[PDB]
Design a binder for this molecule. Structure first.
Ligand SMILES: Nc1ncnc2c1ncn2[C@@H]1O[C@H](COP(=O)(O)OP(=O)(O)OC[C@H]2O[C@H](O)[C@H](O)[C@@H]2O)[C@@H](O)[C@H]1O
Ligand SMILES: Nc1ncnc2c1ncn2[C@@H]1O[C@H](COP(=O)(O)OP(=O)(O)OC[C@H]2O[C@H](O)[C@H](O)[C@@H]2O)[C@@H](O)[C@H]1O
Ligand SMILES: Nc1ncnc2c1ncn2[C@@H]1O[C@H](COP(=O)(O)OP(=O)(O)O)[C@@H](O)[C@H]1O
Ligand SMILES: Nc1ncnc2c1ncn2[C@@H]1O[C@H](COP(=O)(O)OP(=O)(O)O)[C@@H](O)[C@H]1O
Ligand SMILES: [Mg+2]
Ligand SMILES: [Mg+2]
Lengths: 96, 398, 185, 400, 185
């Protein structure tokens, strides 16, 4: 069991992508990041890559061996949640 | 507090589910006497409570001599009123045709007192029953909202809403004459208005969203039978000038075949033709495929209506929604045994594993004013009223 | 008193041109809705799922096109699989080489059939982890198998500010709650 | 014990094959007296034991004088009853016409005794035969399943199933009058029924834009069919028949009318009764020779010459398929291997051993009964396999 | 006196070929210009916004093509999002897979519905800065959140001989007045 990670799969062998099962991906807006995904998969489905570019917040697309067919998932919040947030610059500049 | 098939629902899912039912092929509403207490009406319990207090001497005669009403229901206030009136009218007719002078004067007083009690509560405004433009008052604020919400949610090419009711007051007519909507109720003509049963098959078209249907199952205050064997309708002012003033401020009861409310004089072959036709039209409506029905303000105290409703669920495309304020007491009383027929009927209806039945409980979350709030507005409906200002300016011009 | 089907039909197939199925629409449908013993379903939005009944199998399809031609309406769909009855329930299979026949009726599929398609072995239900609900309908639950996740390959991606760390924490916590003892780097 | 062309098959292959044969152009089912034994009926060899136990005197005077039945068969229970009844009727008619008082008196005592035993085993419910709503009981649970399964497997615009039977009881009509299906059996009217052969070509159709019906052929008659004085054949209700003549036949001991009843194949010498019997055989022959026919057999002992002859000749067609049920294969094979058993055993064995992919034989005792025959048939995915209306109906009945 | 809508329509939908939409326009000046209580509106060229009524929601689309086929005209558009009631106003969502049904009317977008699309989330209004006005209609103002802008990398682009000095000076003048505490090395 391995985890190959690439948000720019163009500069990689499709055999890395064609010899693997499961993937996870949220909204991703880039036209040249799908060439390996376009080629690696066998003939039978090509129209399901259009909607990966407009998923709203909290939605994700998962497909692989653990799933019979590709499915669109709405992920619930995890409780207790992750870190609150990053730094807020309102207080620093309140000196004015 | 909201059940559908045995389990429990929450507010958001219920609100989303209701919106889906409003878009079916056929939609209808059934209202009772509990939908008018918000504008000046009275429940059937209060009428009996007042009559028992006001006329004590006749109460003993009704219970002991003629055996028309029992004692347990009188002491519990669970007495049906229209059936008693029908029986009294039958007794009076038999006594008159038999030529028994002693009993002829005994029932006149009873009928006059009963008609004085029932009629005085049906004037939702009072002495201003005669005047015009009674739909502009604040008391009828929610009937307009109900009608507008029902009408605005229909796509072109679809049918029109159907409204059934068991009241005999003029709330809906007053509300709908202020919006600019015309209702078909079976009558036609102005100088001589008569009943044509085929008028329920017409509609309007434009040669260059106007209409609905209204069925009354118990008559109306403005319907009466003249000397000729025909049924006529008159406006409110004419009825008040003719026969409503004397009922309230006089001991006047002469004609037993005159009035057509509530469910009285049914033994005449000319008057029963109206009740029978209304009931047939109600029965035929809910037999169509892809139908929905909302029930509010109705206490399940009628055998035939319950029989028809329960037998209409055999079709796989009939959905019903029921509102019932006092639900928990019914469950507690049924659990320990006993209870009236209404409680048993509504508890048995609730416990089935059916997804076509929904029951809503609560004390004030099931009232009429809360039923209206669940139905949705369209996005583009004009809400801000900016016309009355121009009317005020024009009136100020003088 | 004899009814062959408990759910009403919508349309019928008139032509096969490979894997593009052509269906004409009836006139009884007016408000883009249909009601049955469980609820109300819609079929008039492209991108949903339909079904064709042919004997002991049910062919599941996906709508692709919709347009007008007396007003006439037509729908194009692609098949993705079929449903089978084996002992006392149902099972979903993942071959799309079977196609319906001409004249077959078209019927929408309810939530009971939707549960079967996005389902896995009943025995693994105590061994499962909950992830989320269906997006289009929000009426189905989604479960995954931890053992099969670490048998084949898996991968994670995502943009910024969309819930990457949320999913990471949610997935990591449940594994520890279910299997406190494991070897993961 | 599932032999197809002499080679055994396993369960899944047989199930797939039977699922494939249920979607042809034409389908049909042939039953017999063995399919009604689970409701209260009996078989042919069971009646003979009761007859020769209840009336041992007639057996002595029926073999020696008139030579109607052989002594070997009487001691082995291999006699044909409805074929003997025809000979008895012929003898009685000849004696009456020739005016021989003694022979006429003698034969009248035998026909009554035969009809009493034949009828008493066919009421199927006892005294409760003249009552109504007899399909609501649990005895007829599988006939309804068979009827429902046969109809529901037909695609739109296809022919309706046809059912033949050698029985003369009322199980199928009772089962069908409960689901809501209507069967066409060649009769019309309500006050005076009559036989109209031309109505077998009709069908129903909805004028709004239901079409649920089936055909039933009775090859040996029925209890409710009788001929009055006129040259017409009439049908009555169960209660009317019971009040008319069945009660007298069962109870009275010196009752016999004559050329009245049309069961089982009794009075064939007349030219007005045999017209009924000939039509059923002609239509059975016409149906079986269709291009895409698939026929099922169950409950038939293969004891008839004409049916076997017409079945064997119909196989000279490359699109005819047959399925046979016979739960006695082992004994038949053992008895035919040495010198050859009865004619039925020889016929079934010579049918089994041929090398054809069309014929199929199933055995294994209780594994090939009528009850187990139903489950082998398929079941639609969308058919509503539940019971929801009962609660609503009982709730309605509860009110008032 | 009783009216279901105070804004006149322009056409209806006659097809959904995937993500595109087909519209048939009315005859005369009805299909190009309209009038209402607040002013006038028009749909003339590709690049405009059009809206489709769908009962409880309102789909928003963008015009792409216009052409002929008295003649007839039709338009092709793509979807963006929708609008819905929340408590007493409206809200804009950014989901782009919801499509209308066949026969639904088409209406232009008024300034009232244009204000909602270019607004902030009802809670950062007291902490908003005014920058300018939109270009196509020059009727709707634009506001931005202080915390959202000056929290990460900010970039200003341009071309030589085109105003990089000028645009830099103007933008940093109008943006960095009240709170100069940020750093520009
Ligand atoms: N504000 C309210 N809003 C809604 N429901 C209310 C309200 N207040 C009380 N209720 C409920 O409204 C109901 C009052 O029930 P009744 O007025 O006896 O029923 P009917 O007159 O329609 O009886 C129908 C006719 O049929 C038979 O022939 C009968 O004789 C009638 O003529 C109760 O559930 C109250 O809790
Ligand atoms: N429960 C059962 N299920 C199925 N088959 C059974 C069962 N019990 C017995 N059998 C078998 O079912 C068969 C019944 O044997 P019989 O009733 O004598 O034969 P028939 O009905 O063909 O004889 C009547 C007609 O056939 C002739 O042409 C006559 O002339 C008539 O026209 C045997 O194989 C039983 O073992
Ligand atoms: N399932 C969810 N539904 C709604 N909002 C979510 C969900 N998961 C995360 N968020 C939002 O995302 C924010 C955290 O984003 P973060 O996960 O750090 O982004 P990234 O995934 O790019 O690291 C939180 O403030 C939270 O409001
Ligand atoms: N206050 C102003 N009013 C109108 N135009 C202005 C104003 N300030 C600057 N401009 C325009 O902006 C442009 C800036 O281009 P410029 O600064 O010369 O490009 P670069 O700096 O890349 O050589 C000038 O052409 C000028 O006309
Ligand atoms: Mg991230
Ligand atoms: Mg420069």
């Amino acid at each position: 069991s391995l985890i190959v990670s690439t948000q720019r799969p163009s500069e990689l062998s499709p055999t890395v992508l064609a010899m693997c099962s499961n993937w996870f991906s949220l909204r991703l807006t880039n036209e040249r990041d799908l060439q390996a995904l376009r080629y690696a998969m066998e003939s039978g489905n090509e129209q399901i890559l259009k909607q990966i570019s407009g998923l709203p917040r909290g939605d994700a697309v998962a497909f692989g061996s653990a799933f019979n067919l590709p499915v669109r998932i709405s992920i619930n919040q995890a409780r207790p949640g992750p870190k609150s947030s990053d730094a807020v610059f309102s207080e620093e500049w309140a000196n004015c | 507090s909201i059940y559908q098939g045995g389990n429990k629902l929450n507010e958001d899912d219920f609100r989303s589910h209701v919106y889906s039912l409003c878009q079916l092929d056929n939609v209808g509403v059934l209202l009772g006497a509990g939908a008018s207490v918000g504008c000046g009406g009275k429940t059937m319990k209060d009428v009996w409570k007042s009559f028992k207090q006001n006329y004590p001497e006749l109460l003993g005669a009704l219970i002991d001599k003629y055996l028309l009403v029992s004692q347990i229901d009188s002491d519990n206030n669970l007495v049906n009123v229209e059936l008693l009136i029908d029986e009294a009218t039958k007794f009076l007719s038999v006594a008159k045709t038999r030529r028994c002078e002693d009993e002829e004067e005994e029932f006149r007083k009873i009928l006059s007192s009963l008609y004085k009690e029932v009629t005085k509560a049906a004037l939702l405004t009072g002495e201003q029953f005669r005047e015009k433009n009674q739909g502009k008052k604040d008391a009828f604020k929610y009937h307009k909202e109900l009608i507008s919400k029902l009408i605005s949610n229909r796509q072109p090419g679809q049918s029109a809403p159907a409204i059934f009711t068991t009241n005999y007051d003029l709330a809906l007519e007053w509300a709908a004459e202020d919006l600019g909507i015309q209702l078909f109720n079976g009558f036609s003509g102005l100088h001589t208005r008569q009943f044509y049963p085929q008028n329920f098959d017409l509609a309007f078209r434009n040669v260059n969203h106007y209409h609905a249907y209204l069925y009354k199952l118990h008559g109306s205050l403005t319907w009466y039978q003249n000397d000729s064997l025909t049924v006529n309708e008159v406006s409110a002012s004419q009825a008040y000038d003719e026969y409503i003033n004397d009922i309230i401020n006089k001991d006047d009861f002469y004609r037993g075949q005159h009035l057509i409310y509530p469910g009285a004089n049914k033994y005449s072959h000319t008057i029963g033709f109206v009740y029978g036709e209304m009931f047939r039209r109600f029965g035929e409506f809910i037999s169509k495929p892809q139908t929905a029905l909302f029930i509010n303000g109705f206490g399940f105290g009628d055998y035939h209506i319950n029989r028809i409703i329960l037998g209409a669920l055999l079709n796989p495309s009939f959905h019903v929604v029921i509102y019932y304020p006092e639900l928990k007491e019914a469950i507690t009383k049924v659990s320990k045994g006993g209870g009236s027929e209404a409680e048993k009927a509504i508890v048995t209806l609730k416990n089935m594993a059916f997804n076509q039945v929904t029951v809503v409980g609560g004390g004030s979350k099931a009232y009429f004013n809360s039923f209206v709030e669940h139905l949705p507005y369209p996005v583009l409906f004009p809400r801000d009223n900016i016309v009355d200002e121009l009317v005020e300016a024009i009136a100020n011009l003088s | 008193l004899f009814k062959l089907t408990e759910i009403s039909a919508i349309g019928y197939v008139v032509g096969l041109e490979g894997e593009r199925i052509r269906i004409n629409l009836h006139e009884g449908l007016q408000g883009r809705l249909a009601s049955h013993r469980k609820g109300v379903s819609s079929v008039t939005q492209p991108g949903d799922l339909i079904g064709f009944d042919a004997g002991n199998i049910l062919v599941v399809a996906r709508v692709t096109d919709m347009a007008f031609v007396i007003p006439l309406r037509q729908i194009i769909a692609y098949a993705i699989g079929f449903v089978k009855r084996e002992l006392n329930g149902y099972v979903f299979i993942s071959e799309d080489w079977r196609l319906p026949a001409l004249g077959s009726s078209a019927v929408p599929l309810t939530s009971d059939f939707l549960n079967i398609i996005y389902s896995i072995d009943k025995e693994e239900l105590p061994k499962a982890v909950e992830l989320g609900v269906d997006s289009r309908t929000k009426t189905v639950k989604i479960f995954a198998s931890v053992d099969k996740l670490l048998s084949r390959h898996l991968a994670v991606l995502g943009s910024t500010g969309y819930g990457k760390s949320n999913f990471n924490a949610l997935l990591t916590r449940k594994v520890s709650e279910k299997y406190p003892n494991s070897r993961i780097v």
